[model samples]
Target: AMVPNVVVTGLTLVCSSAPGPLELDLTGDLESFKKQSFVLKEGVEYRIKISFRVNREIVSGMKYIQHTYRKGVKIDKTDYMVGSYGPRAESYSFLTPVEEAPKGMLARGSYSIKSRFTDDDKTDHLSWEWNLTIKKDW
Candidate 1:
């Protein structure tokens, strides 16, 4: 007798922009499972979408000055395009499952979230936050 191993049929979705904790929902039926990456047999396409919001403010200055600001997110050690914005909602997306989760929990990983703002006073500052999480999916 042999043990029946379950294969990863497909991926529901992979994202790092989940609001607090990242949660993944399964949408298929199978058998026994193991802690591993979802493996799709074939012709299985996973739908992935990444989105987020940014917060910023403007400061009053004296002489000639142009304010420029940009914000972005680094997921699983990879950088994605989170185009620059001036004080509004700037959302971005990218194909996922490219990087593996960090050592530890299933939904544990590292992210470098940052924002850069420049003022006419030739002053520059960067605001950033780090996140680590583990979920059923990457």
Candidate 2:
């Protein structure tokens, strides 16, 4: 029998300034993740969205969490209650609440981000890391 599992497929950053959503790369080790490049425009509103596929079994209490850090110091955290999900060949996507990008000289820098997807049974579906910079331009 095949094992039950969840596969995170995509992540995108949506903002008004861009003509399209900025797709994020979800590959490589944590070090390689830091090398991946993308910048967020300060003063613009941004939203995080992700799509994932579930296999073999339904999931309960499915949720997502994100932690943002600057200079290795924790800066902020956010959570999304994704609720229940069913196994399907197709994927499901969730859009996170909107948040305004920080504006200020002190806030304009690189950040390390950690993200997780989990369920009621304490099963970790996916965990990943990425890097971003807050600048005047996208």
Candidate 3:
């Protein structure tokens, strides 16, 4: 049988400001999260809301998602295991709070935030990245 492909169509960040409660929105042909972008501010938190669909009726094993931040050679990472679902489960959706950036840890300039999802088979998956700026708070 031919392996079906995963499709990721949309990913977005919703927040009142650069340093505030963030909501990462993800959508695609196969799947979609609360999530945040790069910034240096105390009390800022990251959250994710994700929704996705699979081409097959029944799939086994666990599904996972990951978020990573990269500034030149320096890197910060976070991972989430989204649990398992089958045909009965239909499409999947959930909300979870993610880790916050350490105080004064992110420097000013350009950075990349990468988000990815993979199934147990690993063959069906999707990955995306966003380029954002961490400006000086002053």
Identify the runs in model 3 with alpha carbons over 4 angstroms from their true place: 1-9, 12-42, 88-91, 105-109, 135-138
lDDT of 2 by residue, 30-101 (tens): 446667755788888888888888887788998899999988999889888998988887888989988887
Candidate 3: tens digits of C-alpha lDDT, residues 1-138: 253433333433333445443333344332222132445444344455566665556555545455545554437666666666554325566445654433453455556666677666764466766555455451
Candidate order by TM-score, decreasing, is 2, 3, 1
lDDT of each: 0.30, 0.79, 0.50
> Candidate 2, clashing residue pairs?
none
> What shift in Å separates residue 67 of candidate 2 from its native position after superposition?
1.0
lDDT of 1 at 65: 16
Cα-based RMSD of the predictions, in order?
18.5, 2.3, 5.9
Q: For each candidate, what TM-score against the reference?
A: 0.23, 0.87, 0.57
> Which candidate tops TM-score?
2
On lDDT, the stronger of 2 and 3 is 2
- Residue pairs in collision within model 1: 8-39, 107-133, 107-134, 107-135, 108-133, 108-134
**Local distance difference test, candidate 3:** 0.50
Question: What is the clash count of model 1?
Answer: 6
Q: Which of 1 and 3 is the better model by lDDT? A: 3
Q: Is candidate 2 or candidate 3 better by TM-score?
A: 2
